Design a protein around this ligand. Structure first.
Ligand SMILES: CCCCCCCCCC(=O)OC[C@H]1O[C@@](CO)(O[C@H]2O[C@@H](OC)[C@@H](O)[C@H](O)[C@@H]2O)[C@@H](O)[C@@H]1O
Ligand SMILES: O=C(O)CCC(=O)C(=O)O
Ligand SMILES: [Br-]
Ligand SMILES: [Br-]
Ligand SMILES: [Fe+2]
Length: 304
């Protein structure tokens, strides 16, 4: 397809666990789009999750209500590259906004396979006979992302070995988890401390090997959720906030929210009544995955 990964790009992705950044929009187009979208998003009247029983869950699945985000997850610039990795039938099962306000703590080092990390209950389950896990995350810079405003960082080549155990639980305590200094860096996990999930209490991330991923507004980066990733803190030197938008993809055979009609995490609880996965690539998915074809405002999931 037109934006497929090259063979060299595919080799690099396999080695490093991330590939890009690539362009979805020009910086000028992204700036204007984000200006309008940020305002529109303040209206939650069509959101799939009405009652939040609050939470970071307020950032989830706005593609299910928003015209632009419904187009974005389907962008061929994104989907052709996801297809190179995930094959002919692929769902977007989750989206999340990741703001860093001026002064915010960096995102903790983490890896996720099942996404039971915060809730204690798996959200995606791959075939049990196989060795695959996690989700392909496409993280789009809705603003510029630089080290000073909290850009992402990765430890290359760590996507094939988990350092955390998502059957351990971590406690939600925002109070306590605010700019906790960890190996010289203010970091947290949206009210949790991801170190609580470490397989070995005394192990530490190989932060000396971390590399930054600075991006311009309109770019995206592709990485496995099993890759060691984090963000820098936002120093507040800029008075402009950083915004990333994550779209998460799995092959359609992966079980999405098995045995669940609600999720409880990040200090909130939501119903999955108006949730569905979106088929962004191909036209076959097993019956066990609930799909939607349109937003809650009747906009088709297709790139415009
Ligand atoms: C018709 C075409 C359909 C294609 C379906 C999609 C298959 C994706 C395969 C994959 O590379 O998965 C890699 C994921 O699994 C992980 C889990 O640790 O890798 C495991 O898979 C192997 O890749 C072949 C091994 O190299 C690793 O040891 C690893 O444990 C991480 O690289 C990623 O999270
Ligand atoms: O944007 C951030 O600070 C973290 C992003 C992230 O962890 C993800 O996309 O999985
Ligand atoms: Br590591
Ligand atoms: Br993750
Ligand atoms: Fe993450």
């Amino acid at each position: 397809k037109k934006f497929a990964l090259t063979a060299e790009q595919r080799a690099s992705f396999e080695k490093n666990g991330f590939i890009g950044p690539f362009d979805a929009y020009s910086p000028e187009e992204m700036k204007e789009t984000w200006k309008r979208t940020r305002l529109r998003l303040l209206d939650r009247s069509a959101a799939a999750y009405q009652d939040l029983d609050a939470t970071n869950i307020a950032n989830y699945d706005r593609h299910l209500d928003d015209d632009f985000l419904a187009s974005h997850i389907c962008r061929p610039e994104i989907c052709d590259r996801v297809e190179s990795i995930l094959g002919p039938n692929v769902l977007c099962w989750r989206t999340e906004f990741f703001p860093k306000y001026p002064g915010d703590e960096g995102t903790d080092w983490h890896q996720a396979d099942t996404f039971a990390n915060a809730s204690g209950k798996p959200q995606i389950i791959w075939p049990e006979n196989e060795e695959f896990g996690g989700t392909i995350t496409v993280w789009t810079a809705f603003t510029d992302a630089n080290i000073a405003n909290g850009c992402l960082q990765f430890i290359p080549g760590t996507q094939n070995s988990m350092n955390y155990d998502e059957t351990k639980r971590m406690t939600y305590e925002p109070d306590a988890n605010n700019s906790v200094v960890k190996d010289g860096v203010r970091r947290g996990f949206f009210g949790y401390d991801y170190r609580q999930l470490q397989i070995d209490e005394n192990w530490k991330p190989d932060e000396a090997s971390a590399v930054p991923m600075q991006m311009k507004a309109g770019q995206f980066i592709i990485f496995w959720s099993t890759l060691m990733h984090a963000s820098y803190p936002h120093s507040g030197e800029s008075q402009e906030m950083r915004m990333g938008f994550a779209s998460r993809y799995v092959p359609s055979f992966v079980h999405v929210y098995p045995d669940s009609d609600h999720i409880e995490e990040y200090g909130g609880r939501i119903s999955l009544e108006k949730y569905g996965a979106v088929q962004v690539i191909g036209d076959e998915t097993p019956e066990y995955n609930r799909l939607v074809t349109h937003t809650t405002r009747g906009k088709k999931f297709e790139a415009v």
